[PDB]
Amino acid sequence: ATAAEAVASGSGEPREEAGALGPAWDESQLRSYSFPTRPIPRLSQSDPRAEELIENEEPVVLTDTNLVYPALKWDLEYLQENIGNGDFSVYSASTHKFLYYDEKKMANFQNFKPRSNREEMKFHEFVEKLQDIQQRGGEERLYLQQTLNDTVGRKIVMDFLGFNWNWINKQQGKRGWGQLTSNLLLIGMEGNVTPAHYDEQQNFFAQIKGYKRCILFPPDQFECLYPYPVHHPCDRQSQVDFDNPDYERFPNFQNVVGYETVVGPGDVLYIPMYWWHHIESLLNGGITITVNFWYKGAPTPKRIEYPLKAHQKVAIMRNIEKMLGEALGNPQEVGPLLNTMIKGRYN
Amino acid sequence: ATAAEAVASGSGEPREEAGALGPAWDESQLRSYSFPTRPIPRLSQSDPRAEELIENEEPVVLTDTNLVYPALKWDLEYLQENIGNGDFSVYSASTHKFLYYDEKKMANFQNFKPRSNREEMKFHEFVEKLQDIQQRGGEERLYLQQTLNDTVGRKIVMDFLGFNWNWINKQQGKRGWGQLTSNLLLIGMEGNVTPAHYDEQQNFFAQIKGYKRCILFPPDQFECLYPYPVHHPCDRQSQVDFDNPDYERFPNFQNVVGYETVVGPGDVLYIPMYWWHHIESLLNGGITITVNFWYKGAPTPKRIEYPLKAHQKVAIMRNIEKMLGEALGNPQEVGPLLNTMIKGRYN
Amino acid sequence: LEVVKLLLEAGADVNAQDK
Amino acid sequence: LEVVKLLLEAGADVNAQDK
Ligand SMILES: CC[C@@H](CC(=O)C(=O)O)C(=O)O
Ligand SMILES: CC[C@@H](CC(=O)C(=O)O)C(=O)O
Ligand SMILES: [Zn+2]
Ligand SMILES: [Zn+2]
């Protein structure tokens, strides 16, 4: 166990920046949590180990892909001048945690009161409201999350063309992934947190500005992270408050073990499909900018091999909840029926 | 509540037999259980109330159907002489409870040790072994349960033709039921018990000789009776020992309420599909003879009406367990996956 | 086909051992 | 069709609100 407490190195020693510009960050900028973590590997695109982790659907930080090299010059001023006049979704929160919720599922749970509110805005309005909160020492927090579409300026389109499509397109092909579905632009304030959740798509997480601490958990820790019901607005998100974990309701969160890393400008983090991930912008680190690359996952293989992988059971559990909500005619009857199936029978 | 304790009349006063032959039975012949019961209605075939109970799939004892009138002369001697030389399944038990188990499902649960053993035998061998146990004051118990097939003697075939097919065929048609699948002949010793279970078929339960106490529970008490897992050999049977109920494992058995009656020669009990039923041959009442009529249930209606009836949810729960056992590739993984879906999520 | 009909389909098992 | 494939089919939902 002595070697275990040491193997839980977190993100390791902060990287030292070229030109002797000091540590990119310090441990004090990271929030404190209850669980141990390991470092995610930081490797080169050409390192065969990095290739072995991606094909095996394990996370890895790639340091030299140049995936978004043209975008590393992006700041609020540059984007305000060239990202066009399209509408940008901007969530507002009283807290540092920006829990994702699906608006379309809010009807099923009318008792659910979100603490993040979405608001369409022009990017210059976001920079303005961003500047106001700063100038007034306000505790309000903002987090821009917008899919990049046709309504972006020419130079932003030229930056896009300058992405390393040769590299990522080859990755898409070698893993059999589906189409690229979107690129989510992410501009958040220091201290912002996206609580733990998993996505049903493969993700290349390309950091542009600022630093983000990424804590991942493999799909086989489903039992420890307690996602919301599938029909709940917070489907795929963890119910556990990482800041105040309730071990009475979530006892197995005391067995969670994460994979952790801090990405900075130029880093690309492969967040494999179904992998949980907790994203937080370093405290007192300024704004963070990121662009992700969401790809549909490979199809289900013709022949199924047993035993099933953890992510396959997650797919099964999700589908069970879905069709029961469909068959019962009401999502809120899924819980009672399942309990009826279990109590005194399987527990 | 005063009127409730009185409304739980059990099987009511024992019937008095024609010709002043005394009470057909006395309360002391009935085993004692922990739950209250109501009387099932005893009505005439021509009573419109009886028609309303069958169409609404509620139990009812019909007193004058003549469904098996030619079979009311049946005894061990008559059957031994005319039921042919076919093989007859005869379960043997150290106890009065003859819990049904599916032999084909015993592979999935190799830790399951049945206490009833099936044995193919000629009917004269059954009468012989029956006579031996008596002559030796043995505690062994037998229960013949055999589907009636082509290998029965001519007179037994003539008795069959003499059944009131006009009446039951009309019932089959007016309820939209499927085909008649089988007629199970049942010859058991006094005190024999078939513990609580439900069948996926409609059943007309035609008593021939002796008396049987039938305790039924509607499908909406699924939560109180705790069937075994679908893949367990005792699928569709209750896990609760009615003689020693374990309220720690089966807490809701303290809310069970049954419908009860004692049928005798000439009575026909409609046991609706999915309805639980506990069958016991009256103590010190001699052998019992019964022939049931199992019909496939009506198809699923084109348009589904919500809310779903209890039996529809039972159909859903059964199918969920089935496809999970199929998808997971192992029945014994159904429990863990369901618990994973529930704990901290729906409970 | 219809997921609802698949889940509502009833079986036909009874307390009679199959050969 | 194949019950196993129906239950194994993955979705494609991500943390991006749909319009
Ligand atoms: C959704 C925004 C989040 C990233 C993430 O979870 C993802 O790309 O899937 C983040 O950086 O706060
Ligand atoms: C299966 C034999 C049992 C009857 C019964 O449960 C049924 O016809 O379905 C009984 O009388 O002991
Ligand atoms: Zn995500
Ligand atoms: Zn039965």
Q: What is the DSSP string of B30-81?
A: SPP-SS-EEEPPEE-TT-HHHHHHHHTT--EEESS--TTGGGGG--HHHHHH
A250 touches chain B (CB under 8 A): yes
Q: Flag whether B319 is marked binding.
A: yes
* Cβ B185 under 6 angstroms from ligand 2: no
Q: Going by DSSP bridges, is the β-strand pair B37-39/B116-122 parallel, antiparallel, or unpaired?
A: unpaired
Q: Which chains touch A (3 or more CB pairs under 8 A)?
A: B, C, D
Tokens for B273, please give them: 């599909």
Q: Return the DSSP state at B97.
A: B
**Testing the interface with B: which of A304, A321, A338, A339 to mutate, by most B Cβ within 10 A?**
A338
Contact A286, A130 (CB under 8 A): no
Interface of A with D in 127-156 (CB under 8 A): 145, 147
Cα–Cα nearest to C17, from B225, B89, B49? B89
A149 phi/psi in degrees, rounded to 5: -130, -155
Three-class SS string for B222-260? HHHHCECCCCCCCCCEECCCCCCCCCCCCHHHHHCCEEE
What lies within 8 Å, CB to CB, of A316 at 6+ separation is A308, B324, B327, B328, B337, D7, D8
Please tell me the distance from the alpha carbon of residue A194 to that of residue A292, in angstroms, as a whole number.
Answer: 14
User: What does the buried/exposed string (b/e) look like for B303-333 if buried means 16 or more CB atoms within 10 Å of the residue's CB?
Assistant: eeeeebeebbbbbbbbbbbbbbbebbeebeb
Question: Is position B196 annotated in a ligand binding site?
Answer: no
Partnered with residue B87 across adjacent β-strands are B122
Contact (CB, 8 A) for A57 and A273: yes
- Using the CB atoms, write b or e for B212-231: b if 16+ within 10 Å: bbbbbbbbebbbbbbbbbbb
B304 near C9, Cβ under 8 Å?
Answer: no
- Over B264-286, what HEC string results? CCCCEEEECCCCEEEEEECCCCC
Strands across the sheet containing B212-217? B37-39, B258-263, B212-217, B276-281, B193-197
Tracing tokens 């003879």 back to the chain, one arrives at: B289
- B200 in ligand 2 pocket by Cβ < 6 Å? no
Q: Is the CB of B290 under 6 A from ligand 2?
A: yes
Give the pair of three-digit tokens for residue B339. 């618990």
CA dihedral B215, B221, B225, B226 (to 10 degrees): 150
Tokens of B229: 């897992």
Closest protein CA for atom 4 of ligand 2: B279
Experimental method: X-ray
> Distance between CA atoms of A57 and A202, rounded to whole angstroms?
9
Residues of B in contact with A250 (CB under 8 A): 344
The separation between CA A64 and the C-alpha centre of its own chain, rounded to angstroms, equals: 21
Q: Do D13 and A200 touch (CB under 8 A)?
A: yes
In chain C, count H helices and then E strands: 1, 0
Give, as one character, the DSSP assignment of residue B332.
Answer: G
DSSP B87: E
Ligand 2 centroid, distance to B194 Cα (angstroms): 7
Instruction: State which residue of chain C sits closest to A327, comparing Cα positions.
Output: C4
* A319 CB within 8 Å of a chain D CB: yes
Which residues, at least 6 apart from A241, have a Cβ–Cβ distance to it below 8 Å? Answer: none
Of chain A, the end-to-end C-alpha distance in Å amounts to 32
Q: What is the spatial distance between Cα B284 and Cα A34, in angstroms, rounded to a whole number?
A: 68
| Residues belonging to chain C | 19
- How far is ligand 3, taken at its centre, from the CA of residue A250, in Å? 22
Q: What separation in Å is there between the alpha carbon of D16 and the centre of ligand 3?
A: 9
Chain C touched by A107 (CB under 8 Å): no
B237 annotated among ligand-binding-site residues: yes
Burial annotation A53-71 (CB, 10 A radius, 16+ → b, else e): bbeebbbbbbbebbbbebb
Residue of chain C whose alpha carbon sits nearest to that of A323:
C3
- Which residue of chain A has the CA closest to D3? A316
Pocket test of ligand 1: the residue of A205, A234, A295 to mutate, having most ligand atoms within 8 Å of its CB, is A205
Tokens of B171: 């019932």
Length of chain A: 347
SS3 B15: coil
Contacts of C8 in chain A (CB under 8 A): 327
Q: What is the resolution of this structure in A?
A: 2.2
- Other Cβ atoms closer than 10 A to B187: 28
Chain A and chain B share a number of CB contacts under 8 A equal to 93
Half-sphere exposure of A236 (CA within 13 A, CB side): 26
The secondary structure of residue B11, as a DSSP letter, is T
Residues with CB under 6 A from ligand 1: A 145, 184, 186, 194, 199, 203, 205, 277, 279, 290, 292; D 15
Contacts of D9 in chain A (CB under 8 A): 300, 315, 319
Ligand nearest to the CA of B198: 4
State phi, psi for B261 to the nearest 5 degrees: -170, 160
DSSP letter for each residue of B181-209: EE-EEEEE-TT-EEEEE--SSEEEEEEEE
Contacts of A21 (CB under 8 A, 6+ apart): none
Q: If you search the block for the tokens 């010709």, which residue do you land on?
A: B19
Which residue in the set B102, B294, B319 is minimally distant from C9, CB to CB? Answer: B319
DSSP letter at B107? Answer: T
CB atoms A323 and C8 under 8 Å: no
The annotation status of A212 as a binding-site residue, yes or no, is yes
- The response to whether A345 counts as a known ligand-binding position is no
Instruction: Confirm or reject contact between B236 and chain C (CB < 8 A).
Output: yes
Q: Does any CB of chain D come closer than 8 Å to the CB of residue B337?
A: no
Give the Cα separation of A102 and D16 in Å (integer).
8
SS3 sequence, chain A?
A: CHHHHHHCCCCCCCCECCCCCCECCCHHHCCCCCCCEEECCEECCCCHHHHHHHHCCCCEEECCCCCCHHHHHCCHHHHHHHCCCCEEEEEEECCCECCCCCHHHCCCCCCCCCCEEEEEEEHHHHHHHHHHHHHCCCCCEEEEEEECCCCCCHHHHHHHHCCCHHHHHHHHHHCCCCCEEECEEEEECCCCEEEEECCCCEEEEEEEECCEEEEEECHHHHHHHCECCCCCCCCCEECCCCCCCCCCCCHHHHHCCEEEEEECCCCEEEECCCCEEEEEECCCCCCEEEEEEEECCCCCCCCCCCCCCHHHHHHHHHHHHHHHHHHHCCHHHHHHHHHHHHCCCCC
The token pair at A227 is: 């996602």
What is the separation, in whole angstroms, between the first and last Cα of chain D?
A: 32
Across the interface, do D14 and A104 touch by the CB < 8 Å criterion? no
**Residue B277 Cβ contacting ligand 2 at under 6 Å:** yes
- The one-letter amino acid code at B220 reads D
- Between the CA of A233 and the centroid of ligand 3 the distance, in Å, is 15
A200 and D14 within 8 Å at the Cβ level: the answer is yes
Question: How many Å lie between the alpha carbon of B102 and the closest alpha carbon of chain A?
Answer: 18
The answer on whether A197 is annotated among ligand-binding residues is: yes
Instruction: Confirm or reject contact between B51 and chain C (CB < 8 A).
Output: no
CB neighbours of A66 closer than 8 A, spacing ≥ 6?
A164, A167, A266
